[PDB]
Scaffold this active site. Structure first.
Site, PDB file in Angstrom:
ATOM      1  N   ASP A 219       1.024  -1.318   0.038  1.00  0.00           N
ATOM      2  CA  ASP A 219      -0.022  -0.004   0.089  1.00  0.00           C
ATOM      3  C   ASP A 219       0.852   1.307  -0.133  1.00  0.00           C
ATOM      4  O   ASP A 219       2.041   1.197  -0.739  1.00  0.00           O
ATOM      5  CB  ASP A 219      -1.027  -0.050   1.147  1.00  0.00           C
ATOM      6  CG  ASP A 219      -2.175   0.566   1.135  1.00  0.00           C
ATOM      7  OD1 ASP A 219      -2.203   2.004   0.782  1.00  0.00           O
ATOM      8  OD2 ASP A 219      -3.314  -0.072   0.954  1.00  0.00           O
TER       9      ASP A 219
ATOM     10  N   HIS B 186      -3.515   6.085   3.885  1.00  0.00           N
ATOM     11  CA  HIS B 186      -4.384   4.850   3.556  1.00  0.00           C
ATOM     12  C   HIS B 186      -3.899   3.633   3.580  1.00  0.00           C
ATOM     13  O   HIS B 186      -4.790   2.459   4.169  1.00  0.00           O
ATOM     14  CB  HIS B 186      -4.906   4.813   2.206  1.00  0.00           C
ATOM     15  CG  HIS B 186      -4.691   3.821   1.268  1.00  0.00           C
ATOM     16  ND1 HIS B 186      -5.491   2.439   1.092  1.00  0.00           N
ATOM     17  CD2 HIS B 186      -3.754   3.848   0.127  1.00  0.00           C
ATOM     18  CE1 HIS B 186      -4.772   1.953   0.245  1.00  0.00           C
ATOM     19  NE2 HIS B 186      -3.915   2.577  -0.537  1.00  0.00           N
TER      20      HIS B 186
ATOM     21  N   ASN C 117     -13.860  -0.415  -6.167  1.00  0.00           N
ATOM     22  CA  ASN C 117     -15.107   0.543  -5.656  1.00  0.00           C
ATOM     23  C   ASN C 117     -15.863   1.186  -7.000  1.00  0.00           C
ATOM     24  O   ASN C 117     -16.504   2.344  -6.777  1.00  0.00           O
ATOM     25  CB  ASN C 117     -14.537   1.454  -5.034  1.00  0.00           C
ATOM     26  CG  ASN C 117     -13.928   1.269  -3.719  1.00  0.00           C
ATOM     27  OD1 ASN C 117     -14.125   0.119  -3.144  1.00  0.00           O
ATOM     28  ND2 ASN C 117     -12.756   1.903  -3.217  1.00  0.00           N
TER      29      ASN C 117
ATOM     30  N   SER D  53     -11.194  -1.547   0.086  1.00  0.00           N
ATOM     31  CA  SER D  53      -9.754  -1.300   0.614  1.00  0.00           C
ATOM     32  C   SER D  53      -9.810  -1.481   2.191  1.00  0.00           C
ATOM     33  O   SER D  53      -9.010  -1.855   2.946  1.00  0.00           O
ATOM     34  CB  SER D  53      -9.079   0.085   0.547  1.00  0.00           C
ATOM     35  OG  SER D  53      -8.097   0.244   1.059  1.00  0.00           O
TER      36      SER D  53
END
Ligand SMILES: [Ca+2]
Length: 279
Positions: A39, A69, A161, A224
């Site tokens: 990430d 994130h 998403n 996520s």
């Protein structure tokens, strides 16, 4: 063990019903397992990680998470308050820049890195990788995820998403890894969650409280956020000896809450990650 006033997603993963607020889990808590968070990085100094997090690789000028994130995802895997597996070891691999972007070639390098790097780590109970990222279909990206899985790592990846069929996204569309959709606290498919035959499981993804950079906390939404619930669950179950990297996705599906989610399109699994912990 019981954690009162837990984030709703943690409570959900140890419950046969929505609408409760205590997370129940075996005290072993993923001790002896490892989870790689591939990430934007992980803020290892965050008190919530208790020294159990470290950066092991970056492809950029720094290993610092300048986004948040990656830190949020890592928190859902294994932070003391916000995490599923509260005693796991967390390894950060920064394949995404501080804008949350990353070239597929860098992402692929990161996956191959983890497949080798686990041989430099102590993870007697097993190894998991959480990939809260993705883009358009790429056979090379899927193949990298497949190699990582084949090497003996439980790979959990975000479905995406786009409120669309995940067959058109990578690594979501790779059959051999565990593709994770998102749900909300009322057991609805999250409105943005991808779906389709390639999905293996759903996890909590809407309004998820976890760690953030600057030693803070934050609620955000996404597949996520669902992905690290499943990654943490895998680590937890591997520590219990209930499953292995090669069969954890199957085991999680086998033991999931079944048929309880709403607005699941015809042909998509109706399975919600569940630890089957009996206090
Ligand atoms: Ca599969």
């Amino acid at each position: 063990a019981a954690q009162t006033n837990a984030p709703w997603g943690l409570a959900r993963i140890s419950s046969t019903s929505p609408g409760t607020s205590t997370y129940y889990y075996d005290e072993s808590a993923g001790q002896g397992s490892c989870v790689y968070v591939i990430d934007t990085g992980i803020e290892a100094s965050h008190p919530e990680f208790e020294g159990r997090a470290q950066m092991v690789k970056t492809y950029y000028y720094s290993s610092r998470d300048g986004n948040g994130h990656g830190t949020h995802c890592a928190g859902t895997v294994g932070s003391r308050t916000y995490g599923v597996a509260k005693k796991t070891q967390l390894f950060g691999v920064k394949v995404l820049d501080d804008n949350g972007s990353g070239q597929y070639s860098t992402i692929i390098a990161g996956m191959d890195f983890v497949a080798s790097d686990k041989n430099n780590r102590n993870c007697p109970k097993g190894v998991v990788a959480s990939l809260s990222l993705g883009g358009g279909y790429s056979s090379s990206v899927n193949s990298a995820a497949a190699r990582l899985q084949s090497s003996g790592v439980m790979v959990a990846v975000a479905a995406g998403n786009n409120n669309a069929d995940a067959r058109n996204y990578s690594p979501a569309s790779e059959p051999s890894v565990c593709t994770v959709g998102a749900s909300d606290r009322y057991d609805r498919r999250s409105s943005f969650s991808n779906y389709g035959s390639v999905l293996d499981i759903f996890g909590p993804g809407t309004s998820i409280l976890s760690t953030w950079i600057g030693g803070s906390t934050r609620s955000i939404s996404g597949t996520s956020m669902a992905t690290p619930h499943v990654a943490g669950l895998a680590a937890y179950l591997m520590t219990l000896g209930k499953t292995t990297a090669a069969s954890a996705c199957r085991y999680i599906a086998d033991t999931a809450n079944k048929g309880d989610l709403s607005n699941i399109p015809f042909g998509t699994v109706n399975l919600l990650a569940y630890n089957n912990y009996q206090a």
